[PDB]
A paper describes a structure:
Tropomodulins (Tmods) constitute a conserved family of four isoforms that work in conjunction with one of several tropomyosin (TM) isoforms to cap the pointed end of actin filaments in cytoskeletal structures characterized by their uniform distribution of the lengths of actin filaments. Leiomodins (Lmods) are related to Tmods, and constitute a subfamily of three isoforms: [name], expressed preferentially in differentiated smooth muscle cells; and Lmod2 and Lmod3, expressed more abundantly in skeletal and cardiac muscles. Lmods are distinguished from Tmods by the presence of a C-terminal extension, featuring a proline-rich region and a WH2 domain. We show that [name], and not the C-terminal extension, is the main factor distinguishing Lmods and Tmods as filament nucleators and pointed-end-capping proteins, respectively.
The structure of Lmod1ABS2, the strongest nucleator among the naturally occurring ABS2s analysed here, was determined at 1.54 Å resolution, and shows residues Ala-314 to Gln-486. The structure superimposes well with that of Tmod1ABS2, with a root mean squared deviation (r.m.s.d.) of 0.57 Å for 131 equivalent Cα atoms. The C-terminal helix is rotated ∼4° compared with Tmod1ABS2. The differences at the N terminus appear to be more important. First, in Lmod [name] lacks the N-terminal region that in Tmod interacts with the DNase I-binding loop at the pointed end of the second actin subunit of the filament.
Author numbering: 314 to 486
Write the structure that this text describes.
């Protein structure tokens, strides 16, 4: 029973050099199994820069798969998880994976079905301390402490990566 996602999934699996994004945002036809299949196909894909699956009913199982994938994938720079069913458990799995990923620069997960809660926000801020490459975090923190801490950490990271880009440019100047 071939779905409409067969071709894009197989392009990812083939490392199609023209398949530079996977954007399945708003796909009413997609399933959690297909989302996991895309996620596993991305582990060793070296082309895709964006994985966007906003508003696809993605749940914690999809987020766990994504966390695993982020430990392998060195190519995706932007990940859109907005408007799904992911809980603090899924979000924290991803921030734990970001302890072992230095290439993702944008993560967003606005408007989940349920807020993640203050305890999760605190642990997000703690985990982010250890990652110096995330530059954009699309989430509005309910608690001010995590909110301002994360804002300061993203600024830290932006400053650090600008320093590293100048250094790299100067290196062969
Ligand atoms: Cl975890
Ligand atoms: Na694969
Ligand atoms: Na990685
Ligand atoms: Na200078």
């Amino acid at each position: 029973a071939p779905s409409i996602f067969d071709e894009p999934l197989e392009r990812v699996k083939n490392n199609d050099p023209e398949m530079t994004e996977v954007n399945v945002n708003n796909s009413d036809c997609i399933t959690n199994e297909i989302l996991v299949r895309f996620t596993e196909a991305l582990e060793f894909n070296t082309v895709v820069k964006l994985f966007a699956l906003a508003n696809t009913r993605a749940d914690d199982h999809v987020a766990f798969a994504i966390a695993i994938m982020l430990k392998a994938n060195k190519t995706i720079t932007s990940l859109n998880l907005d408007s799904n069913h992911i809980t603090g458990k899924g979000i924290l799995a991803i921030f734990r994976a970001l302890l072992q990923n230095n290439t993702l620069t944008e993560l967003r997960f606005h408007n989940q079905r349920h807020i993640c809660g203050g305890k999760t926000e605190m642990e997000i801020a703690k985990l982010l301390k250890e990652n110096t490459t995330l530059l954009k975090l699309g989430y509005h923190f309910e608690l001010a402490g995590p909110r301002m801490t994360v804002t300061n950490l993203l600024s830290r990271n932006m400053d650090k990566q600008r320093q590293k880009r100048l250094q790299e440019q100067r290196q062969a100047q």
